[PDB]
Amino acid sequence: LTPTVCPVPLAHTPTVTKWFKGITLHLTAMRPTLLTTRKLGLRADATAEWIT
Amino acid sequence: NNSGRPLQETAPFGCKIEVEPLRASNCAYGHIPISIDIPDAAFVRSSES
Amino acid sequence: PTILEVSCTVADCIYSADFGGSLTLQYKADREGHCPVHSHSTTAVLKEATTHVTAVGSITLHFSTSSPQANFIVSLCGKKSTCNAECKPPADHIIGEP
């Protein structure tokens, strides 16, 4: 077993609408794609979800 | 014989009547509330003007 | 190069993270050189660090604030000057800059 580079696909880049203290992500996917966020404050409150 | 006058000399607000799509083009009523998205390339910063 | 007859004034102010405000400024120095420009508040950071003075010239500056109004003093080359303002809320309420 040995290390080797390999290609992985880039997803479709999102579309953001900007409401007051808030983001909406108009996403798309055909296959399960991980999304993950976190704050930059003391409370990191991370999120993970495999949207389809 | 008793048809009366057409719409081209009775229509209010100065409308000219085109017949082939049956339009009432080029007349004036109300206000048109629009909004223009100015591109960010026609803006020089205030240190240069 | 010492300094005389300074009077700052504002033209427009937003309060944001980008440099929104822009103030003009008059100065009557006796000689020419490089004099430091600074605001002595803690809510107005000033972009231009230095400038080049002349006899009867004028300087346009840039700053950024978070206070809903600006009452702070700027400083050219040693002596202070005061000028009031009135800052407005911005429209783009998500931006990519801290």
Query: What's the rounded Cα separation, in Å, for the pair B8 and B28?
Result: 15
Taking residue A4's Cβ as centre, other Cβ atoms within 10 Å add up to 5
B35/C contact by beta carbon, under 8 A: no
Experimentally determined by = cryo-EM
Neighbouring chains of A at 3+ CB pairs under 8 Å are: C
Q: What is the CA radius of gyration of chain B?
A: 22
C94 to chain A, closest Cα gap in Å: 6
Chain B residue closest to C48 (CA)? B47
CA–CA gap between residue C84 and residue C11 (Å, rounded): 10
Place of tokens 């700027």: C74
Written in H, E and C, the secondary structure of C20-82 is CEEEEEECCCCCCCEEEEEECCCCEEECCCEEECCCCCECCEEEEECCCCCEEEEEECCEEEE
User: Using CA atoms, how far apart are residues C6 and C78, in angstroms rounded to an integer?
Assistant: 11
| Residue C26 CB neighbours (<10 A) | 14
d(CA A26, CA C77): 52
Total residue length of chain A = 52
Q: Which residues in B lie closer than 8 A to residue C22 (C-beta atoms)?
A: 46-47
C-alpha distance from C60 to closest chain B C-alpha (Å): 6
Strand partners, A37: A47
**Count of CB pairs separated by less than 8 Å, B with C:** 10
Q: Six-digit token pair at C90?
A: 């911005």
Cβ(C33)–Cβ(C3) below 8 Å: no
**Overall resolution, Å:** 3.3
Q: Are C73 and C39 in contact (CB under 8 A)?
A: yes
Using CA coordinates, name the residue in chain B closest to C25: B47
- Give the C-alpha separation, C7 to C25, whole Å: 6
